[PDB]
Design a protein around this ligand. Structure first.
Ligand SMILES: *[C@H]1O[C@H](CO)[C@@H](O[C@@H]2O[C@H](CO)[C@@H](O[C@@H]3O[C@H](CO)[C@@H](O)[C@H](O[C@@H]4O[C@H](CO)[C@@H](O)[C@H](O)[C@@H]4O)[C@@H]3O)[C@H](O)[C@H]2NC(C)=O)[C@H](O)[C@H]1NC(C)=O
Ligand SMILES: CCCCCCCCO[C@@H]1O[C@H](CO)[C@@H](O)[C@H](O)[C@H]1O
Ligand SMILES: CCCCCCCCCCCCCCCC(=O)O
Ligand SMILES: CC(C)=CCC/C(C)=C\CO
Lengths: 11, 326
């Protein structure tokens, strides 16, 4: 999920 | 009886002394002392001085930084544009009218300032819904083998405009109406009079259900599923300290976004619901603008939460503001 959390600007 | 009616307005002040005037024609210093109009002008100045640079800089750094022009960022740019509609279509007009003591642009300018102020707030409203849907679709992967692309991002922005037009156009064509509110210096949807000629009641209900309940349920479900997905993944991967930090940060942001959303629209929900239900009462024009305070300020703190607290945007803005190096 770490990559998708960066795409959406949450991590 | 504690109000004065006209063909296109409703001043919340009794005319038993004969001093009430049209909010389109004469200052309203009988419902508020002149200094309160100056403080109203002072607050509009604050929203302009803070809301314009933070929202304009968001559009500026996107032009300069290629890594910001991704489809998942379209709705954030749509949020900055909506805040600018609130700044120029509403805040600047109200700063001007409050300095006069009344709405000088008349009923036509009332529909104009009311259409763009409602449009700006609704686009920002539905941008926060669409952003939650996309973050839920991308992270929770609820659909089988789906990748979010540019065409899905454009439809997400177009969906916000359609929902906003489905919310600001009806008052211009006879479903509800735009009239000066509170201190009569800014215009908005009529929920203080039961104007049966334009069916104010069925619109306020449609306003509450479709444009507040539906957005609130969608935001809670999407971000609820997201926090569940993230906590589940981290629990199944406690050997990764980075995944444990991400779960905390994602949870902390979801709480901030949901609480900020409530602070924005819940006072405007209940207070306008009370003014609508317990109608015709002795509403203080100062009490009218208590919900408008929290909602209008979202033009400033939505960029802080959704842009400045985004690592990719904050780094590009520090680079741009610091002349090109940081
Ligand atoms: C609540 O507060 C006020 C009282 O209810 C009200 O203001 C009054 O409005 C009326 C008009 O609707 C004003 O009437 C004019 O008064 C002047 C001087 O007294 C007259 O000269 C004038 O003559 C009229 O016009 C023509 C003659 O040329 C003729 O066709 C008319 O028949 C008539 O003769 C009017 O009589 C009145 O002065 C106003 N009073 C004050 C104290 O302002 C407010 O409008 C009302 N507030 C709201 C928001 O409606
Ligand atoms: C940012 C610029 C705002 C312009 C402020 C407009 C001031 C309103 O000027 C108006 O002129 C009338 C006739 O002279 C007077 O009754 C009052 O001074 C005032 O209501
Ligand atoms: C009422 C508004 C007050 C404005 C105060 C903000 C001042 C910020 C200081 C800017 C630092 C200058 C940075 C140099 C740019 C390059 O690098
Ligand atoms: C209940 C009313 C007159 C307006 C509701 C405004 C709101 C809480 C959200 C609008 O999108």
């Amino acid at each position: 999920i770490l990559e998708n959390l960066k795409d959406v600007g949450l991590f | 009886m504690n109000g004065t009616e006209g063909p296109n307005f409703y001043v919340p002040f009794s005319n038993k002394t004969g001093v009430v005037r049209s909010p389109f024609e004469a200052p309203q210093y009988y419902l508020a002392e002149p200094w309160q109009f100056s403080m109203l002008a002072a607050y509009m100045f604050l929203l302009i001085m803070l809301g314009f640079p933070i929202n304009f800089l968001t559009l500026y750094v996107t032009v300069q930084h290629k890594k910001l022009r991704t489809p998942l960022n379209y709705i954030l740019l749509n949020l900055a544009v909506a805040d600018l509609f609130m700044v120029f279509g509403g805040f600047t007009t109200t700063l001007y009218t409050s300095l006069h003591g009344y709405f000088v642009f008349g009923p036509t300018g009332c529909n104009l300032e009311g259409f763009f102020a409602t449009l700006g707030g609704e686009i920002a409203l539905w941008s926060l819904v669409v952003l939650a849907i996309e973050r839920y679709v991308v992270v929770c992967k609820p659909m089988s083998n789906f990748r979010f692309g540019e065409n899905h991002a454009i439809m997400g922005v177009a969906f916000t405009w359609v929902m906003a037009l489905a919310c600001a156009a009806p008052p211009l064509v006879g479903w509800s109406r735009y009239i000066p509110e509170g201190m009569q210096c800014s215009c908005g949807i009529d929920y203080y009079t039961p104007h049966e000629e334009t069916n104010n009641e069925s619109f306020v209900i449609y306003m509450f259900v479709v444009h507040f309940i539906i957005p609130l349920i969608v935001i809670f479900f999407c971000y609820g599923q997201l926090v569940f997905t993230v906590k589940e993944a981290a629990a199944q991967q406690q050997e990764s300290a980075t995944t444990q930090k991400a779960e905390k940060e994602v949870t902390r942001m979801v709480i901030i976004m949901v609480i900020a959303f409530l602070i924005c629209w819940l006072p405007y929900a209940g207070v306008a619901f009370y003014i609508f239900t317990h109608q015709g009462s002795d509403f203080g024009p100062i009490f009218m603008t208590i919900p408008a305070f929290f909602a209008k300020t979202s033009a400033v703190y939505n960029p802080v939460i959704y842009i400045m607290m985004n690592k990719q945007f904050r780094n590009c803005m520090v680079t741009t503001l610091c002349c090109g190096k940081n």
